Amino acid sequence: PEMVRGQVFDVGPRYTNLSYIGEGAYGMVCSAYDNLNKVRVAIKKISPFEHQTYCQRTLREIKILLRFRHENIIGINDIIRAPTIEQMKDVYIVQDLMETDLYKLLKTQHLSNDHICYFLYQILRGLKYIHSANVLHRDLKPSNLLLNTTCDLKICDFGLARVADPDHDHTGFLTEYVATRWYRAPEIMLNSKGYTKSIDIWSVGCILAEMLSNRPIFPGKHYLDQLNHILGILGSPSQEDLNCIINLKARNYLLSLPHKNKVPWNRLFPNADSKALDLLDKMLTFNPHKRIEVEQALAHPYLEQYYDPSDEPIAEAPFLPKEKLKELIFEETARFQP
Numbered sequence: 001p002e003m004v005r006g007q008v009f010d011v012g013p014r015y016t017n018l019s020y021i022g023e024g025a026y027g028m029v030c031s032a033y034d035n036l037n038k039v040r041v042a043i044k045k046i047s048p049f050e051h052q053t054y055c056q057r058t059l060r061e062i063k064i065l066l067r068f069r070h071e072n073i074i075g076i077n078d079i080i081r082a083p084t085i086e087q088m089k090d091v092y093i094v095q096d097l098m099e100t101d102l103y104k105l106l107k108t109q110h111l112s113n114d115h116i117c118y119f120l121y122q123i124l125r126g127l128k129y130i131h132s133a134n135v136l137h138r139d140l141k142p143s144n145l146l147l148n149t150t151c152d153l154k155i156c157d158f159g160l161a162r163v164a165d166p167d168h169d170h171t172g173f174l175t176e177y178v179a180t181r182w183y184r185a186p187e188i189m190l191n192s193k194g195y196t197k198s199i200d201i202w203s204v205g206c207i208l209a210e211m212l213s214n215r216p217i218f219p220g221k222h223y224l225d226q227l228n229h230i231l232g233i234l235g236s237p238s239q240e241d242l243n244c245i246i247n248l249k250a251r252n253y254l255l256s257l258p259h260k261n262k263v264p265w266n267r268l269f270p271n272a273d274s275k276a277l278d279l280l281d282k283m284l285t286f287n288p289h290k291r292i293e294v295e296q297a298l299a300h301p302y303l304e305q306y307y308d309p310s311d312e313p314i315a316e317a318p319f320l321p322k323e324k325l326k327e328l329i330f331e332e333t334a335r336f337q338p
């Protein structure tokens, strides 16, 4: 078997000429030559079977991506694993080879307003499909957005995704949460489990702000610090918005803070398109009930050059210990045998 960086990466004989790309949430990622389709591909090696939560994320990623079919969501082209459960220790997911991700791109490249507009259009177009399937991505951030050489954008990594459940979204103040801190909506720290679609719109708002300046807008250093970054820009929530927070611990925390004025978007982003900042304001709305939804965002004037609801498709239908989960992962990957 071909090896890379001292560890096994046996994808052959179909995939050859391996090249290491990097280390991701699951393990090692390489590019390789697909001898059948005569193209290079990306392959990620996943080794989850020791742990409930690892097997959880792997099953979510595989199940969702195999059911979704959308130009702005990465597909699964192939899955490589041993022929038997007994012999299966690793799973390799084969996907289209992209040129970069938005995290790497924003480290070194200034985006033109035309690129910002096109990227945001594609994020929202993909998210319209995700949300139409009743699925929440719950971890949108630049490193989960891949781009090819012609700047086609694909949403990746559904390992933290969930089916939306707005009737069970309420929780207490400072409830623990898993998704990435800088892209977390304020209500996560206050009273929300992140089971409603507005959680994803907040993340997209954060991504838009980061495309405008090449810096995260809310770079909190720890859990409650994240909220104090958000409030330092949005300012103090209104009485109406506080009245929507019935939980006393969360409400009284906000009431305990000195008054903070809103920082105007055009002061933070003096080079930005004014229509972009209008949409940014609507995505980064404190009250999740007032926050713009994905289909309204697509119809915003900023996106007028691209908006076409007939070309923004929706999903055909809405969407346990490790031993049962290994069995599920084995079952979910059977179609690629062999």
Ligand SMILES: NNc1nc2c(N)ncnc2n1[C@@H]1O[C@H](CO)[C@@H](O)[C@H]1O
Pocket: 021, 022, 023, 024, 025, 029, 042, 044, 095, 096, 097, 098, 099, 100, 101, 146
């Ligand atoms: N799962 N990640 C990933 N998928 C890729 C793909 N389909 N095409 C190109 N690069 C891909 N990466 C890169 O691998 C590294 C570790 O995550 C990072 O640098 C990513 O950008």
